[PDB]
Amino acid sequence: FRPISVFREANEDESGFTCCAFSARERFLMLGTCTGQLKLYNVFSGQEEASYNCHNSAITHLEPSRDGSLLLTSATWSQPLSALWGMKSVFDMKHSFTEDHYVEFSKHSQDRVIGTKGDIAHIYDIQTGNKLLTLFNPDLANNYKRNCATFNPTDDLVLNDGVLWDVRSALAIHKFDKFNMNISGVFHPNGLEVIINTEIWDLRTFHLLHTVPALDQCRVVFNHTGTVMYGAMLQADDSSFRTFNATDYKPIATIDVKRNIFDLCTDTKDCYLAVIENQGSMDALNMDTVCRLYEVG
Ligand SMILES: Fc1ccccc1C1=Cc2ccccc2C2=NCCN12
Numbered sequence: 001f002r003p004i005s006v007f008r009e010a011n012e013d014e015s016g017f018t019c020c021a022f023s024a025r026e027r028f029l030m031l032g033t034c035t036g037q038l039k040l041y042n043v044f045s046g047q048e049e050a051s052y053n054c055h056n057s058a059i060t061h062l063e064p065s066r067d068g069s070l071l072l073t074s075a076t077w078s079q080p081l082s083a084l085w086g087m088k089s090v091f092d093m094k095h096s097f098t099e100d101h102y103v104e105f106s107k108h109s110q111d112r113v114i115g116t117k118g119d120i121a122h123i124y125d126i127q128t129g130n131k132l133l134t135l136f137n138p139d140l141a142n143n144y145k146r147n148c149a150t151f152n153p154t155d156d157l158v159l160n161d162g163v164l165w166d167v168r169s170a171l172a173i174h175k176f177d178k179f180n181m182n183i184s185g186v187f188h189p190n191g192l193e194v195i196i197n198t199e200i201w202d203l204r205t206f207h208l209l210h211t212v213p214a215l216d217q218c219r220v221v222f223n224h225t226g227t228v229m230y231g232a233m234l235q236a237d238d239s240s241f242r243t244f245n246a247t248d249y250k251p252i253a254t255i256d257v258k259r260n261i262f263d264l265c266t267d268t269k270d271c272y273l274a275v276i277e278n279q280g281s282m283d284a285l286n287m288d289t290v291c292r293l294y295e296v297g
């Protein structure tokens, strides 16, 4: 991991970056802040290019659409808690998701949003903002304290609270047992496997393929090709980022950056990893984060 850039928040005695993602214009990173600002930075020069107030509480999460026309945000204690913003021409609010603490785009065709409210997943039409679908069954719930509902790559399955759902029928196919209190899990990009904390399950059989103890409590991100997997413990859930070969799950690196981690993300070309680190302790009067960019390839 070769350091390529470092940069804080401009003109802030206390730098308050909390999350990050690559924009559709490579060279430029979008960051959320502890004051609910969305900022655009040149990721090499550290130059702040634009700023908008999205929320009156901290940003926890953001996701740009691929086509560069839309942005999803989630805040901490704001009503509404999550929103969808338009970025074509002018920056403006399209829809709000009143109590959803987390939101993502669909994957294969980006025409829907999936939101989470405690144990319950909500699917929404992007163009109308309607709720199309509520996925919740009280007799299959795991009650994961960090539950984050997510589409599979083809947009026809959802994982919510450790339960696999088939969208077209709105039927629960399978409930994976509970083995931790917090983490509800993600689809592998290959479409064949699910990662729920330290368990990797096959979607053919529901048989355990791998135990990866090092993944305990970790959020997970993939490079664009789906061949490398990064994991870290995140602040929004509460210094070691791990990297794994995404086919066999054997470790490639264990970095200790010496600093608690707020977020990590990949570019579309498998070239860069961007990480938000705090230089402060948690017991400090104030936050002091940096964004670090690493060459990987
Ligand atoms: F949005 C959240 C609200 C509460 C707890 C965690 C998250 C969250 C989930 C996530 C999943 C995969 C990759 C990155 C992330 C992430 N980055 C910042 C915080 N965050």
Ligand SMILES: Fc1ccccc1C1=Cc2ccccc2C2=NCCN12
Residues within 6 Å of the ligand: 038, 039, 040, 050, 051, 052, 086, 087, 088, 089, 090, 091
């Ligand atoms: F304001 C922003 C806040 C956060 C992220 C991006 C922007 C932004 C920067 C921009 C730069 C040059 C030309 C047009 C634009 C623009 N039009 C709408 C969105 N947007």
Ligand SMILES: Fc1ccccc1C1=Cc2ccccc2C2=NCCN12
Residues within 6 Å of the ligand: 157, 173, 191, 192, 203, 204, 205, 206
């Ligand atoms: F295996 C099952 C037994 C009973 C019910 C469903 C399945 C199943 C779910 C699935 C989900 C995503 C990708 C592939 C699959 C799959 N491939 C074969 C079987 N199968």
